Every structure is written in C-alpha cells, then in structure tokens.
Design a protein around this nucleic acid. Sequence first.
RNA 1: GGAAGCUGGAAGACGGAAUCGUUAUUAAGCGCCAGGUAGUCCUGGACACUGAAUCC
RNA 2: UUUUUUUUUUUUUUU
RNA 3: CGUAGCUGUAGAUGAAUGCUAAUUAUAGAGUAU
RNA 4: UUUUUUUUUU
Lengths: 181, 123, 171, 156, 162, 447, 26
Amino acid sequence: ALSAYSLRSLIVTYNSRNRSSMNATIENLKNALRWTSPSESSSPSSAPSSAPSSAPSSSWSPFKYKYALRHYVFEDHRYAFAFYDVNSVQEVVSAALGAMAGETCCSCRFSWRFAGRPPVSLPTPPRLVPSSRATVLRGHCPTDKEFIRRALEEEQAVERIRKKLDKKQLQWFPGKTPWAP
Amino acid sequence: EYVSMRYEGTRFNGHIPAFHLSTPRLLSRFDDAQQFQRGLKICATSWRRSNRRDYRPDLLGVRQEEIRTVRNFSPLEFANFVAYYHKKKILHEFPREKLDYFYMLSGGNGFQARRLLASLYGG
Amino acid sequence: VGVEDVGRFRLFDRHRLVELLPEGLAGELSRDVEMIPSATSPIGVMLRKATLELQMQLELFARVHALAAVQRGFLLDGGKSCVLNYLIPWARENNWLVVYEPLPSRYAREIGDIKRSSAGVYIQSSFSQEFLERLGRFNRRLLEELPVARRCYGQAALDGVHRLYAERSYH
Amino acid sequence: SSDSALISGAIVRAFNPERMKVFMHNGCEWLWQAEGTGTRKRAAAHVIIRRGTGQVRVNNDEDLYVRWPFYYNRMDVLQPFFLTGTAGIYDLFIHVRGGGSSGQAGAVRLAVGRALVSACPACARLLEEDMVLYEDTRQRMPKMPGRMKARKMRTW
Amino acid sequence: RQEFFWPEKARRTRVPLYQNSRPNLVYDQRFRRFMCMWYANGVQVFRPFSCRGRLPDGLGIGRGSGTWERARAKAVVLLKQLQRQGHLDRLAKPDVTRSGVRGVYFDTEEKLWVATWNEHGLRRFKAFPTMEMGFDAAYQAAVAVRRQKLRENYIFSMQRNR
Amino acid sequence: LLDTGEIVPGAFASVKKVGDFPLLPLSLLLSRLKERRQELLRDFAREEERIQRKIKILELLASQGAIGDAKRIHADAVNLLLLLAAEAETLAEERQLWRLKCEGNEEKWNLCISRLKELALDHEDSFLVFYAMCSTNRFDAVLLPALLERLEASFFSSQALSKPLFHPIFEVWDPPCESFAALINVLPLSAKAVVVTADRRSERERRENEGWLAPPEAPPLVLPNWQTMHPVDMEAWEKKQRRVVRTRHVKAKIIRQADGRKLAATMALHGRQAIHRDAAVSSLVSVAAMCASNSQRALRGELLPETLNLLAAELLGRSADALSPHLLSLSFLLSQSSVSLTERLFLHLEAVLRGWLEENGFVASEKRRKASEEQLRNLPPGLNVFGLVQSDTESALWESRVLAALLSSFLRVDDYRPSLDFVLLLSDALRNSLRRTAVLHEKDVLS
Amino acid sequence: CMNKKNRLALRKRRRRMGERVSLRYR
RNA sequence: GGAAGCUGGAAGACGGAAUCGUUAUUAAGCGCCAGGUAGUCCUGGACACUGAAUCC
RNA sequence: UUUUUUUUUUUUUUU
RNA sequence: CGUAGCUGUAGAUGAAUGCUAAUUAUAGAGUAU
RNA sequence: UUUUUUUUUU
C-alpha cells in the first residue's frame, strides 16, 4: 500500500571538482541542522569515496622527435552521506540540496520499505494459583544501533549481486554470439 | 604413457588408461576385499607424483570409517630423528641451541627435514 | 614394545633386511641409507603411533581364526608409507604370506607389449612373468605345500577374464 | 612484601587490566597475547602471537613452507624468534594481502618485531643488533618520460 | 672454472651459493650441483657433480641411481681422500685484491675502512674509523666483520683471481 | 640374542599391558611428608635460585595458613588450594561450630578460582590443580578446558624424558618419576577417563533443551560521527605523521588447535590393553566410559566396535558375586552404544537383577539402606548420571533416585526387546510401595 | 603480437581457461 | 592486415678489437593494460615482481 | 584441526 | 602473472619459426598461388 | 605437466 511506505534510508552523494568547493558544502550542510522542531536534529554519517584522477598524454613544440612530454592533470573529489529513519522528508531533502555551492552536483538514492502483516498476538497472559493439595551525545545519530545493522546488511547484498550480473553481460561488440549466423 | 586409438574424442589424446591394463587392474579393486577370507589388503599414498586435490574417497571403494589420516611429527618425535642422524656421522655439528629453531623452518615434515639438514651442515 | 615405547628406532641387520625384503626398501628409504658413510651400520625405523593402532588389529585377527575381527582393508591418507618399512618385515617374521609391491607402476610406464583382444583388456606378456618371479623370492616353501582346490579349475580366459564375462562380448 | 602490593594492586582493574598474565619474572616475562603490524613495499601484514606450541599457519589453513619454499625467505620471518629464544613456545600467524614472493617476507619481520616489544618492553634492546625494527618507506622511482624506455636506459 | 655465469631466463636468487661448516665444501642452488672448494696452487677449482636423472634390485645405493642424494654421497667420500692422502690441503698464498679480502675498499674523502655487505636487502656503512686506530688495528677489525657476518646467514662469496 | 649381534625378532610378537592399579588421595601423602623432613634436606648464579625457593615451601606446607583471605586473595595461588582441598576431604551443638568452618572453606575455595583463571598457569602448576580437583570431586566446566592444553603441549615437548623432576616437593614422594614423561603414563585409570570424557560446550549452547536462540557474530559496530571525520584533503594528512598508521584492511583470525584431543587419543589406547588382564570390576568401568564417548573420539578409526566387543566378551564370562555390586554404572554406560554383541551381554545382566533385589529384601529396612549407599558414593568414582545422581533423612529419599535411573537404562537399548512385560510389572510394583512412604517440607524434593 | 613475447602470451592465457594448445615452437 | 594447424636442409657457434653510457629498489630479465572513437606494429607514454657487483 | 584442510603471491577499496 | 619450488622425458652436436592449395576473426569491400 | 561415478564378472 502506498500509505504504508516509509523512507528507510537516503544515501546522499556529492561530486566536486575543487577542494575549496567541497569544504563549503560541508559547512553549509552543518549550519542547516540544529534548527529543526525535534530535540535532536538528523545527523548523517560520513563516508569518503577516494579522489579519482585523470591525465592524458600528448607529444611535446611540433616538428620534434618526441623528446619531451606535457601532462594535464584533472583531479576530482567525491563525498557520500548515509541517512537512517528519515521521519521528516522536508527537513532532510531541502537541507541537502540547499547546502550546494558552485559546480557541486549531487546524486540521491531513496530507499522505501513496506510492512507486511502487523504481528498482533500474545493477549493478556493466563494466571492461576496452587491447588494446595536520554544518554544522547552531541554529534551522534539518535537512531537505534539495531536498526542500522539490519539495514546496512541489505545494502552490501545488493552491491554484490549487481557487480556479478554486470560482469556477465559485458563483452565487446554487443549482440554477437558464437556460431550464431 | 601408452598410445592407442581408444580415446573418447579428447579425453586422453590417444592414450591407454592405466586402470585399463591387465596388471594395474589386478591391484585396482578394493571392493573385492570381502572375498579375501584368509587376510586383507592395504594401501597408502604419500608421494607427490600427482596432486591429491579433493581425492574423493567415497567413489573409489573405501569408506569414511577406514581412512587413517596421520599428522605431522610431534616435537617429541622430531628430537629423536635429529639425534638418530648424529650417531650415523651424517651431520657435522648440531648445537642444542638451534634444535627447536629448525622445527619452525621445515615445519616438522619428514621430507622437508631430511632435505633441509642434508643441504646445509645442520644446526 | 607397547604404548610406553613410541617414536623409538629399532635396529635392523643389513643382511637380514635384504633377505626379508628381496624387492627392496619400502618407500624412499633407499635415498636416506646411502648418505651414511659406514657400510656396517644398522638400519633404524621410527615406530609411529599409527603403527600401534594397526598392529593390534592384526593380533586379534589371527587369534579368531583358530564377526568380531575386521574383514576389510584399510587406507592411509593425509609419513603414510614409512610404516610399511616396519609392518611388512614384522608380519613376514610371524609366518604370514605377504604380497610385496612397493613399485606397482613399473609395469605401466616402461617398455612392454600390448595385444588388443575382444575382451577389451590389454595384456602384457613381458611384465606378466616378472610378477610371479619377484613374488617367489621369499614366499617360497609355502606355496608348494599349500593344496589346490578342484572347484576353480579352468574357468578363466587367456586375458584372465571369466568365461561368463568373456562370452558376453560375442552376444 | 609491601612493594608488590602497590605494583600488583595497580595493574588489576583500574587503567588497563589487559596486562595481567605473566610467566614469572625471569626467563619468559612475556604476555599471553600480542599484536603487531608491518608494511613493506606494496603490501601489508598483520601478525598475532598467542600461547601454544602448535604449527605455523598463514592463511586458508595452509603450511608455511608452501608460501616461501626458499630457505633464505623462511629464515628472515623467524630471525627474532631465535634471538629472543621463543623457538618453540609461541605460535605464529601471518596474514598478508598483495605484494610478491620476497616482498611479503620483509613485512612479516617488521610485523612480528613490533609484537615482541609490546609483550615485553625489556626484550627490545637485544633486537637492535640485526636492525629488525628498521623499515624502508622508500619505493620504486617513476619512469621518466621522453626517449628513455626505462628509468635511465639510453638509446642510439 | 672461475666464471660466474648468470642465465638470462632464470629465477634470481639472493644467495646463489650456500656456505657450509666444512671449509672445503659448498652447495650451489642455481644448478642444484654440489661442489668442493680448494686452493690447489693459486686458484679456486671445483668438481661439479651431476644431479639429473638417468640396475640392481637389492638396495638403492650407488651405481646408476638418479637421486638428489647421490651428489651428497659422492662429496663426502671425496673429502676424506684429500685429507688422508694429504695431496692438496695448503693455505691460500693466492691473494684476493689490493684492499685485502674481497668487499673491503679504502675511503677516498678521508681515512676510513668501509665494509659493505647485504643482509635481507638492507646494508650497513660507516663501519670503524682508521685515524683513531691507525693503519693496523683498524685494518684487522675491518676483515673481522665480514667473516663473522657470513657465518650466520650462510653466504658464500666467490674469490676472484684479480 | 641372534648371532649377528642384534635382538631376537621373536620377542616382539605381542603388545604389553598397562597398570594404573594404585590410587591414593592427598590426605595420607601429607602425613609422610611431615615425617621425612630431616632426610629431605640432605640434597653458578642459578644454584641459589633453585635452593632458596625450594626449601621455603617445605617448611610452610604442613599465605598465613587457612586464615587472612580476601587481602591475599606466581605460585602463591597454587599452594593455597592444597590446604583447602585437603581440609574438605577430611569429613569423608555439634552441627553449629562444624558448619561455620565447613562454610568458610567452600566460600574461600571458589574465591581462589577468580584469580587463578586470570593468570595462565605454567606446566609445573597445571597438573597439581587438576589432580587436587579429582580427589575432592570438584570439577569446573570452564576451567577444565583451559588447563588441558598445558598438559598436552609439555607432554610432547622435546625435553620430556631427559628433563628432571619439578622442584615442588610433591613429586619426591611419588611412585612415578622422569618428570611428566612417565608421571602421566602411570596415571590411575579412574582419572584418565576425565580427559576423554570432557565437555567442551560453551554457555551459548541452548538449542537442545532451552529453545531457540540466535547467536551474534558481529560484536563490534564501528560507526563514524561528525567530530571524528577525516578531512577532505587527505593527501596532507599523511605528511603530518611520524610513521604510517592507516593501512589496508588486514586482520588475522584465531585457529583452534587440537584443544587437548591429541592427548586424549593416546589415553584411549591404554584402556584397550587393560581388558584381557582379568582385573577387578571397579577398574574395568573406566574403559567403558571412554569407549562410550560422543564428542571426542568420533568414528575416525574402526577401533570402537572392536574394543567394545572384546570388553563385552570378557565381562560376560564372570562370576555373579563380583558383578552384582557393579550394576548401575556398567548398565548406564553400556546402554549408550549399539553393537552386535548386545543381546547376549544384556541377557546375563538381567538374570543377576532377580537375585540382587530378592537377597536385598526388595519385593528389616537396614538391608535396603546400606545397599543403596554403596551404589551411590562408594562405587561411582566421579560419574554424573541421569538427573545428576552423583558421588535417607527419614525414609525412601535417596534409594528412590537410584532405582528410578536403573529402569530407564534397560529401556534405552536399541538392539532388541528391552525386557519382558512381567519384569516391568514386578519392577514397577517394587518402587510403587517404596515411593508411597517417601515423606508424603524442605528443598529435598524430587525435581 | 609479432615477437615471441606477446605471441606466446595468447597461447599461455588460453591454457588457464581449460584448453590445451601445443606450445612447442614459438 | 592479425593469429593458428600441417609441412621444414634460407645461409647463423663470427668475435674476447671496437663504438654507443649507468649519479642502487639505478643496471639486467620477465609479466599486465590505458588511449589511439571496426581490425591495425617490434616505437613512445604508464604500473608491478626477482634483482648482483665496482676504485666512481 | 586425532571426523580440520588437502594449499603459491599483484599495481583502488572493509570510511 | 612470468621465470617458481617440486617432478617426468634425450646429462639436445639436431630447436634457427620465414616460405606456403588454405582456414579463424573485424569490416560495405582485404581478393588470385 | 592428462582422475572415478548410475552397474552384467566367483
């Protein structure tokens, strides 16, 4: 049922081409917090994604026998964030997009969950007689640790399956099969 | 190592299986040990002529209750082996200080112990 | 001898060992004996724990024949061949007919002869003679004394195939 | 016996209860369990020491001579044990990921060396003779561009 | 006989030759051959023993047995022949080089005695000085380091005629 | 001897037997030590070390006695256990003073365990602790596995036969010698079964009687935060350190060793040789316990059925006088395994039951009282049986438990018919009237 | 793959995939 | 144009003379791919393992 | 691990 | 991953790999001996 | 540089 859905998690990722631009986004995102209605604001976790780089090659002045070369480095930066138990969608989605500055795109990943049959059993227990014959830190997520462990395992399972299937359907000249003609 | 025309396409590249011969087949049947009312048979395999790999014991004739899996020599037995060679004038000088040091090197294996001590002076 | 004596070396006479094992030493022991410079030195074999468990079974098997005793072969998997240098000589000393064959592959990776037949089993005339010649070196004086049954006279083919199984090829 | 009360009474509970298992004062003075890490070339290592006179297993339940068939390689990953006298007392577990044949052997020497010092501060001065704690952070130089196919391979 | 050939397509080993306790003995790992070292007149000469494969059925000792232990058995019998007969046992009057033993060289920038040697890829330098000990005490200590360090790792160094 | 200068080969025909006949407690041993004090004193840097410590313990043993605990609660923790262990075994207006001393010993005995486990015992102290518990019949399911490893590693050590005795004087007045080499070889057969029949289960094992239980496999849950997050510019972070700290994920796991199973296999072979020696019935009970293992021996070798068949063959051919007393222990262990020689063995054991109960007065209450006591404590050395009857107030309180377990043992068989229907009615009626007079109170109620 | 280095690589690569290619010359 | 089966008696054991240079994870060997927008090099670019010696 | 295995190692990652 | 270790063959006087009646793959087209 | 199996051998 549509009304039974709930945003389980929202992985927010960033891709910045400059060091200063990425730092500005972190400060902007933090400022948006500590201002919601609930006592503890949503505190997402950090997860760096390395820093890919690329640098092509070219011969170097024309009319030369390739004695020198000139390279052009093109670095990059990435950042990923994790969310759990996003009760307020307006106070999270708006804050993430509003923290951008300059050429810093984003890529969200929603994750819903549907509940089955609500377990409702164990009525008032029977009884007889013998016959005589708080603790919340400052910069920490308020969600329970048990919920994160259950959701974290699911993410690791989907990543393994996608990589295995993607490798199978990866060959040169798509649509070619042996002794098909 | 024989060659013939009994290959199943590419199963042997035109070779005669060893178990298909006369003499090897006579000593390649363990399930017939029940007919031996006088005695019994026994076999062992320890050399490196071929990689054992999985070495399925169920599809060969023996059972899981008749396999004796030995282990590496214990430290007590290792000391005796070294001392035995000394009486034979095999080694030159084997100080007691390095007696236990060599145990970790070869791991106590018989094949690795005799070869390691033979190449070097030992100890 | 017993549980108290484990991992000890038993001296063996050079001359007595050759007679007891005319074919040769069990396993790769021949590579370790040549290293000794002394020619009159004895040969020693370690008594591993694996031999004690196997030796006890043989003792009970002999006494019964005079369903508790084992009536099947064993298998050593994993120093598995080291015990053969001590179990065979001991059994032969107790009036036991032991078939010795440390190198059975010699009849399959050497110069020989093969003749195809209808039974589908290749024979080796050259290697067939060596099997009996080597077995009779030490097992003599007993085969001749042993009688021969009359119920198994001649029901084997030229290639050793049974009459019932050989005639099936012509069906 | 008042001196022992202040020393033995402080190690228990309080700051660090891990240091509670010892083998007398003289002769072993080694901790029950220890850890060490070593890095050499494009590889890493994680060696842990535990009480026991068992064999040596690297990974995937295999022997030691399989990874290092050469004699010189096996001696380098066991030099500290001989000097310290722990030839047949403590176990050895080597875990590595990446590198080469002799590249992984060097990482073990640094990893195991840093574990013995933690288990016994006193048993660290004698290991400086062979330069066990010394490492090599330097790596291979890059291939310069231009005409030289290799680092300094000239051409006609 | 004194040529140290290095095959192109082969595995490089850190210690090609392994030193043994016996003076007149050395094991070669490159060709898995056993050799004996002795000074003859002036030069080092060896007697390589074959270890490759190809008979009586009594015992696998001697004759045509293509076993790795044949070379070891052939070396022990030959060692006693030289000592018993006393043909060639005599000290190496042949010198190594100008700077005493091999591997030791004098310093050019000042008075020092450098003794370089590899050990598990590492190396040492500096060694002992010469001005603080003269040209006699310092020289004696320089040679003592090489001989002492070679007895632990079992490293054999070939002596060159020049 | 042969003419070639060697031992005659005919001598090596059969296998020798084992002893393990004598068995004494730690009570009479101390009395002899206190008498031979003037003769034991007759006996380099290390010269003083082996003498200074070696004599201080002799005078003390006879740390201020059995008083001054807590504060005092190294070999100090080991010698203290001997005083407490020996004091408890001494038992085997008046109930007021005695209870005060008995309670103190029990409370202090358990307290010493906490400090003992926190420190790994040496080879010279592991055996002493284990031996003391056997005499006092006070084992631990948590401490037994830990001490079993030490006795195994040192047993197979290179310096086993050449090494001299341990310096505690306990080994001086001992039959065996040669340090731990021959000490364990002459171990009583009663104590040998403990190693083989050792429970290696943990507390998490609850999927058999309790119910469902999901075990965890991820204690550590490392989660980052905002205050301890790595900076964006990680390249400069590595340049601000003295040495390499962060490294690829490389962690080494722990591999379990034999855990004492290697030593147990050697001990199992000793019981096999002690069957065809025509020994006492009490000594033969230990052989069955080892052969009836379910978690150590497994079925690697084909020796379990062979040993069991031989044991049954010798047991069948025995007089009823020596077999009647020993019926609960033998039947309890022999019923846990199935073999071909099962029906024949049980038929003989059933006949003696008819005469045993009839002669004891079972269908003059002193005949039935003394008989039960011998079967409950005297016979069973350290065994723990169905419902934990293990080695009387008014009437029919202790004897009922013995009879309750006996019936279940005969009905456990899985080879043929347990017994006759007539026997069941007779057996049921035997205890029917006995349980009627079982005091219709206190904690002494059948749980 | 003109030289003996690159050309022999193709034959060795196929040997690890469950095929047998003669090796011998080149 | 690239590779492969079969077949195979293409031209080579000459010269210890001489010219191109390496500041040690240098030198000497061996193995892998990224781009060149279908295939298409023994050169160039780029990574990893074994890795000795000398008076520089 | 005495009913356990049946074995060579790479150039990004358990944040 | 390659020279592995290990281990069978001939401890090669004879291991040079180009020439071609003939097919494998990309491409719209690379064909004739 | 290459392993057996769906059953018809006293």
